[PDB]
Amino acid sequence: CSSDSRYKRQVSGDEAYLEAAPLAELHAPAGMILPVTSGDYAIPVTNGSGAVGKALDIR
Amino acid sequence: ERVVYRPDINQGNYLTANDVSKIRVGMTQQQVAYALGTPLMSDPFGTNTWFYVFRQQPGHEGVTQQTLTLTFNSSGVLTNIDNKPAL
Amino acid sequence: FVVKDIHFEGLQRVAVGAALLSMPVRTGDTVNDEDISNTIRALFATGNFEDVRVLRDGDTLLVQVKERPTIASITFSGNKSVKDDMLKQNLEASGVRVGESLDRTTIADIEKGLEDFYYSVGKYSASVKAVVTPLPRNRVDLKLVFQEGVSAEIQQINIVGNHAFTTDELISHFQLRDEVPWWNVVGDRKYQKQKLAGDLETLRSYYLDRGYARFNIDSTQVSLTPDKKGIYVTVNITEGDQYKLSGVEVSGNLAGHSAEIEQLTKIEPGELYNGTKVTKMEDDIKKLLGRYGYAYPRVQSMPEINDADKTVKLRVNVDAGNRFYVRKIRFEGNDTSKDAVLRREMRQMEGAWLGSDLVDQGKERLNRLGFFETVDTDTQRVPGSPDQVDVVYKVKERNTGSFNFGIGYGTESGVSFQAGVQQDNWLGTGYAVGINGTKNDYQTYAELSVTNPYFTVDGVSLGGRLFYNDFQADDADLSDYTNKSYGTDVTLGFPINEYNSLRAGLGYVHNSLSNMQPQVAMWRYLYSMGEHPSTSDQDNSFKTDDFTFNYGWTYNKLDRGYFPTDGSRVNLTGKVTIPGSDNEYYKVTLDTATYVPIDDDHKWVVLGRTRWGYGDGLGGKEMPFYENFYAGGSSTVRGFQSNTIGPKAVYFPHQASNYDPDYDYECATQDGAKDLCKSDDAVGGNAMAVASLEFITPTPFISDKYANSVRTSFFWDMGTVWDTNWDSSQYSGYPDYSDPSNIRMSAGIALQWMSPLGPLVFSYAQPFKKYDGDKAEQFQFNI
């Protein structure tokens, strides 16, 4: 049929974004704090959790 | 630095001596912004200090720089026109 | 009545409820037969229903419908040259497509709009017959029978009211073409009124640049010549007698640079008026104030035409922006190679006033990159302040990876193969990886060429080379003169100007020679080496550890790094020995690449690729024979085989070859061919003069979607390579090659197809001049 690295092929999927890269907020002193959240940077940690990542099925 | 030519490095954004004399301690930011618009650098978390800092280095003959700040107060009324030379 | 139930027959694209809402009576509404006939027509107002027979069972409605919708196919027949989709676009304009609502009414309406599309083509002599062919369960095939007669073509243009310049004079300036004799072709003559509109503006310039500023084209009357091909134009103009640029009075917000702006408006008061220069001279202010920070310098001129002396008076009104527009910049299409790699290819810095051309200079470095497909940007003014412009450099990148081939034979010969593989912008780093080598039963070879182009940011291309030629000639090895060669070179770059860049490194080689051949020039360099190795034998071994300083410099004002169409690049490269070397010589060569647009649209472009060189000793010990110059085969001159342009070595009266085998490897060995024979492959000279001249040529059979990556290019390739020390006093009874006229020649075309492994080029070329004999393969397969 096919061949790739002595397998057939390799398809797309991720758990790396599920690994959710570490974020360390500012402890910045008063009068030395920027408006440090702008844009669509708005992540409500919401949970209908279900399967997640590659285990998350998609229909 | 035993080289003579360098590909010339600049950094503009500077209120010239006209732009210094155009404005005065007491002006609003707007009073400067009608002529001189925004700065490309202000205070991020303090007062309204409008920074306009020139830099340039031509030819291993040193670097030049003209560091201009415009400290408007919390109300934006100008309180300091500090233009600093190189170094 | 009042309907208790509607019977919903035959809908098949619309729903029952979607029918029911298109029915003015819904199930339960009071019902008139007026409303029933309204239910007839408003379901015809679906556009989907062939017939609508609304009736009722007393009051219980029933709607008998066979239906128009989803078209299963639209068959294009007669759509030879005009694209299906072009013809489909008028159909796609007509609200009907495959899977849409048919209407058997709008058949000629689509067709007329297609002849109205034919009207726009450059013809009307073409027709279309759409044929409805009903298909299963509602469906319909739309067979479009195209009755395409003919186009139109430019036949004549009468310009009345013109008395200054001749009409056909102007037609020669006009892209409306009409001259191809049967023995004189300059192209073709075919028609568009859009050329006409531009050639009206070619005319509109054509009086204006003189001084005619009350020049005005009154009207233009093109023929309905009764042939459906004939174009006879009756242009009405007013010649509009000339005016003089009698003065400039530039004004407005001149932004304190008006003296410089006055240098852009240094005119002659009373010169014969050129509005196009005036059009240009407005923009001269705009780039200037652009370079002065003001990205938006509104400059409006007004040549106040004074007819009382036949002059104009150029009012200009200027209004600049503010300086510090360059706030920051953005980049897009940086999705494989590093953003900061593309950010360092710019020249306008953020946190600054604008120098307008540094963007374009920065975009030219990206245009001179060659990992790109196009280089563009977005120079939006971010709203909010007159120091607020970000520049969003959206660009497009190109594919990489390449191959070069070489083989004698597989699975029946020995382990013999030539390799080579290329990976540049190596994993999105900008690094170039090009590595080759070969292992055969003649020799073994290893080589590397990998650069860190920005190991240091100041142009510092950390490019190192190593090679290991275990060159053996494994057929009679000791008699076939084994010489293993290996050595190093690391080379570096720096932008000495911002379009000029230097190259420099140290070259080392470790040649290890053994039983040199009885060639005359072979011992002759060894004679200049101070050696006196024996002509009549193959007996002598030799090592050299030559330490040279190689160098270079790159000029770069040519368009693309991968597919240019305009400009030139100068790349001088050479080497000179240092003390510590086993020989004191030099070796310099010259590399040329210029692109001159034959077509101003650059469809044809002169491709001037010539090669030059000279290397000699530094006194005493000569330049080695392996540093000679050549051509032939895949080279400047192709249609040949390799090493056909140069000196051709004579052998010596010689027996002991170490036994070159039994009438094999004749070098005037003892096995036949003795006593001073001469080879015909070019062993090459210490001077190079070769030149290849090529032409970008568009094909009409590959679409320029994917013909634009293909450069078909014809050539008449020729050149001369001679050795200044190949003396006629030493080479008289065998041919001499110290003349700087040794013109071999072969002419033909190359075949550049751009594959996913990059451009792969073959060639066919025909030699008709061979200076002192050339091995010629007319079919040439380079990449």
Partner: protein, 371 residues
């Protein structure tokens, strides 16, 4: 070999070459290479035993109308412009009115060549080339030019008496609106497919009625070159619209007696009560003058390059730019003859004058024809 090169689709050929009453030439001659395949409204005028004919690059030859022996010759080849000795390039036809030969030229010029020698007894530049033949009448050289300008030039010395914009869209809807005179009115059609009457004396519109279509949004062909020039039987305007659509109107008010908004006609004459015509399909029919009742037809010419229908030698005669001539039945449409005297053909009109049938050919020029 050539079996697989390219493709087009086009017209139908000529059927029925007939020789029932076998035709001939009255004489044969030439005036150079004349009106040509280049579309131009030049054509000779036969008068006074003088073949007033010109080739459209040069010589205006008076030939004798017996043998085509030259009576005089001058050349209207332009000695002036951006260049000396440029060709003639004439747009309007030969108008011999009094002692001048008036010809509208593609140099946007109208001349008056003195009929005794051809000396241009006056010359006048006009507003564009003469798209129609200049109707030289009442001292008014009345032209429908390529811009549609009703111009009146003094036919005595050259003096524009008015220049009034005629009816044609922006691009030249090439086709005649030749200002033919009726009842002291300038009776003009229009290349938009309208029809009008204007004042003959000053160029003041008596009326103008739209008849039918034109190019643009009811788009008609590039072959559409239709004489909107009327043949007004005294009070009844018999004209075509620019798409060939025939009609009958009032002369002084433009009130429609009848209208063929079905007309597709190249060339049209009113022959008694029988409008004889050359269709755009080149089918020769006979419509009425109190309607469009087909009195007879002939499809024995189909998609030809026909000239105007004329009656000569006892037959309706039509020729073509295919070079055929044909002697149509005056009744139902049968060729009683066919005369192949050219094959380059005729853009000029069959002049049944001097008892001849005068045609300058396109390139193999002037013949005269009889039977």
């Amino acid at each position: 070999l050539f079996n697989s090169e390219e493709d087009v689709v086009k017209m139908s050929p000529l059927p029925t070459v007939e020789n029932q009453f076998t035709p001939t030439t009255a004489w044969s001659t030439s005036v150079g290479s004349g009106i040509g395949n280049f579309y131009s409204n030049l054509h000779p005028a036969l008068a006074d035993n003088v073949v007033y004919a010109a080739d459209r690059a040069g010589l205006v030859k008076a030939l004798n109308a017996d043998d085509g022996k030259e009576i005089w010759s001058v050349s209207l080849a332009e000695k002036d412009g951006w260049f000396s000795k440029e060709p003639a390039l004439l747009s309007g036809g030969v108008t011999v009115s009094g002692g001048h030969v008036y010809i509208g030229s593609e140099k946007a010029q109208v001349y008056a060549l003195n009929t005794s020698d051809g000396t241009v007894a006056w010359q006048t530049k006009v507003a564009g080339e003469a798209l129609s033949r200049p109707v030289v009448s009442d001292g008014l050289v009345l032209i429908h030019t390529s811009n549609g300008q009703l111009q009146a030039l003094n036919e005595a010395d050259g003096a524009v008496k008015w220049t009034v914009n005629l009816d044609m869209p922006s691009l030249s809807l090439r086709g005649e609106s030749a200002p033919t005179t009726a009842f002291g009115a300038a009776v003009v059609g229009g290349d938009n497919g309208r029809v009008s009457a204007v004042l003959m004396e000053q160029g003041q519109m008596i009326w103008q009625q739209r008849i039918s279509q034109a190019t643009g949004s009811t788009e008609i062909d590039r072959l559409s070159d239709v004489d909107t020039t009327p043949v007004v039987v005294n009070g009844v305007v018999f004209a075509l619209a620019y798409n060939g659509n025939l009609t009958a109107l009032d002369l002084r008010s433009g009130q429609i007696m009848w209208k063929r908004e079905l007309g597709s006609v190249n060339d049209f004459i009113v022959d008694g009560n029988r409008i004889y015509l050359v269709d755009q399909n080149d089918r020769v029919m006979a419509l009425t003058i109190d309607g469009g009742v087909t009195l007879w037809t002939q499809s024995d010419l189909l998609h030809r390059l026909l000239t105007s229908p004329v009656l000569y030698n006892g037959n309706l005669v039509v020729g073509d730019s295919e070079g055929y001539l044909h002697w149509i039945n005056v009744e139902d449409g049968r060729f009683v003859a066919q005369q192949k005297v050219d094959s380059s053909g005729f853009q000029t009109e069959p002049v049944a004058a001097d008892g001849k049938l005068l045609i300058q050919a396109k390139d193999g020029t002037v013949y005269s024809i009889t039977r």
